Point group: D2
């Protein structure tokens, strides 16, 4: 009873290998309309459809030195249907520059009862038609975010198991409709836990994820994994080097992600624009063996410098676009181990709770 | 960290006892719009809002001999917001007759990739806000239907796990918002399987349901279960008496349903209006100890005569009403052990696939 | 692929219903040779084969007013093969008085690595032949003890799951060889935890047990469950009435043990001889509905008064035997709700760690 | 609470690299006494302690051309405590030739009730004290064999769960006592199944093994895996090239074995001495990225010529020895990609059931 034919299988592998092609990464430009409110209000701008339109249009129409740095662009619903100033739909803008377009399909998180503050994610209702439509309209991959937090009795048995189960459902549905699932099991940096405790939980959680994807029969070569880096909690007093968290990210994934996964696209997680680039470099330089692409899927850590330089004023466009382009060139050096560098609001920490 | 307070728990427990208080049953007026169309071209009536309002009004305004036999009625979402000719809203029409109002909250089945024709159910997205409102609007319990088929390589381990889980998510969200969940893991009659096969599969399903409802921290005294009876398959050559169906069914449950469950309300299946009331009676006369209510949540098997009397014509209203009443009274004595059979609509098999 | 024929099934049900027949309980006289060392040294006696022989012979040859109080006697290996003074093998002594004989088959506990102090149990190697032999030699049921402790991260996911898995293996093997498994998932009273925390863990652990027994295909009507009472930890400062722990024991089991289980034979757990009898009475008087026998399988709480009165001196035999008989009559009133009573070393607490 | 210290972890990791260091393999001299009898009436020799000591001595004293091709040898327990004619103990005979000494620690398969002919394995009882001593006596790794069969309703979900678990218990106990565990989830060739079927089942087994080894907190850099190659079933009508077996086998592993596993040492199956070395070579020439050692743990398929030369007669010693050497050298170049085939004992299928 094949889940997929040969030709669907090779077309998902094809898309997946494009997105993470050597030296390419992803721009996560998929902020909910309510989440992009607090980004905009941090630079004084009002949250109107055309302020979001112009901001998203800022990122997509940047110089062609970004073209080989950005293999894919995850958008939010409203944005997939928005047009540029030259009248081209935003997905054609991205494809014209050699970027594959994706689409966030999760409908936010929801509380699991019986737990200390834990969530599952929702969005599976009608997800099959939506993917069918988003595929007609230009999308080729998808993002579903699950959220886990390290606390004293968290992440619990039930939490890890329901979040792993709905990631796999999501990925099964995505792949029947020709769309590559980005799987996002996120562990947040909230808390005071040390490096090794993030390591032990990352492992425990990816183990449960790849078992869930096996149970649901999903083609691992046409998926991507979007995991946290492995980092001390944001209240940790101990301090850890870039090498030590490289080792600990890379061994956790060695220990748990089968080589069949096409690529691994890290979240930035709240790290500064620059410590994100620096860590991604420490990781691709690790001497250990790493049979999958280790690259980036960054929201805040490609966009903070560009937002502060945009300011709300169309006059600042070319100023802000080159804060975005310097970040994409920087990260495309780090996803190949070639990043050697001093930056100011590229050093601001981007952690929220 | 507890899902529910002691007040929240007495409410749920009291609601679930009112429904299956001795001699009472559940009338499943649940049919979606498209599934009730198939019932209405049965008798040459077009499928209009008004015909659907009229036929429902005929079951909920049947005379007061039926008040002691109907603890609850499950309405599709549309019916909940329609009014009798009196102007009285249908929730308040049945409140008046000593019955609790349920709501169907699932949203149909969807296929599971990699599987031989199997399904999970969808409907969790926005469930909690939906239930909060149904509760304000008169509903005190919910129905959600998962469907398994016996067959070559079915019901799969993946389909059992995914269905028990999604019934557990549904149930936790119902109790948070005050609503007793009904838990319907229906195993279809379709196929040539024998009684004992269907006993195996039922036993292994309900075990997996109650491990899932335990993992999700579900309050069992405020639940009900609506399973199938254990029956030979509808195409099975060999023949089985009604006391063989009573044993096979009482024992499937005594090996799986914890005593704390407040009530078991059986589903009719493809069973004739009369076979369903004889197998229900044979079960309550089964002398093996049974520490839950054994009662009925029949839809087709309480309405077949009703429907082939009415025929779509206003004049047959009291003739239809009476045939639904005669069934409700037969089933309310089946629900006590006290039914001795002594028409043709009522011996017709009501099977479909 | 039946696990058992009809005739094996009815012979296990027959044995199980004997052991817990109305007003009957079990004597747990199965102390390891190393465990019975610390019992003997507490009364000054040397641990020699004939001091154990004479002590076990004290309990088995007691007055015939014990005959209707004691449905079964769990022995240790060496003891199954030991003879009385009249030359009769100990199992014939027990059968002559109407007691079924059992046999502890677990080979002690072992540490699970990676956990904070947790154990699994071993004993499955060659268990199938041993049961075959013990059945030829008089044994008809068996005891396997698993041990869980409540602490901060205990009992963990892995611990509950391996102990539930090897209980079920044990029970599968026992039943192929015609022997009724007593399943002993013990939660110890060590720690300072309140009543509700023992309740929540008992539930979590029996849920996992009955799922494990379902997965392994074992006939629940020819088994017994030997669970702790549900009690505050032994360092709890809060205080709780006999009724409150009756409620909490009886609801935990209602919520999780299917009625098919023939009987529930509690461990005493360290409680005093008398608080054990008192609590077992509070439980059989609980107004809730309880579809399985609630009776006793006591080691320390039928034998402390008899050991202190035996003292090591054969002269004290008839003195010590009537400390054992008064305890068996007392508990056979409590397993029927008829125990109304002041005792001294029958009030000593028997808790070890 | 960690299973292992950093010293305990480097030791294990170093041991596992010595065994599968490039070009080396494992000789399975493991056969129990009863299973080697079947091999020795093959060539008309009676099964004596001395013949068994003599035949083993012939493989472990083969000349020094084989030192670079044999990183480890797995002895049955008896062989570990026998001496060559020199007086030198067999563990120290192979220490001398640059090979690590393994020990078989399992204790045979046992049936699983309720199942269609399926097995778990036993041998955990007393395992830890056994391993502590094997370690003193020269063993640095262990073998434990679980067996699954493809067929009607096989390998069952119960048999997969129970076998992965018991291999995880075995592995945790080996690493506590210093011994690298080898993890052999063998899927038998028996049956008419096609290559792709056997790929499905292998994929779903090794996924369940590595969720179990993760749950049990198993150190993966100090493990090896000894699985079957993915092969059509021995009775399959249709025919498959060796590059179809190489793809089907490299991809089954890339979808399941985490990169951290130090080595994969294949089992021969019923494969001819020569087919086994061609499929091993086709696999190391498979250009798909493979981040583990792909090498051999052959028993029958490194000794068939050896055995039909020797014939039971002292005079053929150096003729036998040479045929085992010619195989070890073929297999050590298969283990690098560098074997081009260019007798009859060596094309005979070595299948059994």
């Amino acid at each position: 009873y094949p889940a997929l034919t040969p030709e669907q299988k090779k077309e998902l592998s094809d898309i997946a290998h494009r997105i993470v092609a050597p030296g390419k990464g992803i721009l996560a430009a998929d902020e909910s309309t309510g989440s992009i409110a607090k980004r905009l209000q941090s630079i004084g701008t009002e949250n109107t459809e055309e302020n979001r339109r112009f901001y998203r249009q800022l990122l997509l129409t940047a110089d062609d030195r970004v073209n080989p740095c950005i293999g894919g662009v995850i958008l939010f619903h409203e944005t997939l249907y928005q047009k540029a100033d030259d009248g081209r739909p935003f997905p054609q803008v991205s494809k014209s520059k050699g970027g594959v377009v994706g689409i966030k399909v999760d409908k936010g998180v929801v509380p699991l009862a019986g737990t200390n503050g834990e969530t599952t994610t929702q969005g599976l209702d009608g997800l099959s038609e939506r993917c069918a439509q988003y595929k007609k309209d230009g999308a080729d991959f998808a993002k579903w975010r699950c959220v886990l937090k390290i606390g004293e009795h968290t992440p619990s048995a039930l939490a890890i198991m329901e979040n792993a189960n709905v990631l796999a459902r999501y990925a099964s549905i995505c792949q029947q409709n020709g769309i590559v699932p980005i799987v996002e099991p996120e562990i947040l940096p909230d808390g005071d836990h040390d490096l090794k405790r993030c390591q032990y939980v990352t492992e425990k959680v990816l183990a449960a994820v790849y078992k869930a994807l096996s149970d649901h029969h999903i083609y691992l070569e046409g998926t991507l994994l979007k995991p946290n880096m492995v980092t001390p909690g944001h209240a940790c007093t101990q301090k850890f080097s870039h090498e030590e968290i490289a080792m600990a990210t890379v061994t956790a994934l060695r220990r748990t992600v089968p080589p069949a996964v096409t690529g691994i696209t890290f979240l930035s997680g709240g790290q500064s624009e620059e410590e994100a680039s620096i860590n991604l470099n420490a990781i691709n330089k690790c001497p250990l063996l790493k049979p999958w692409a280790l690259t980036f899927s960054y929201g805040r850590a490609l966009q903070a410098s560009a937002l502060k330089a945009w300011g709300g004023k169309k006059e600042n466009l070319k100023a802000a676009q080159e804060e975005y382009v310097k970040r994409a060139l920087a990260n495309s050096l780090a996803c190949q181990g070639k990043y050697t560098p001093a930056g100011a609001a590229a050093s601001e920490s981007l952690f929220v709770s």
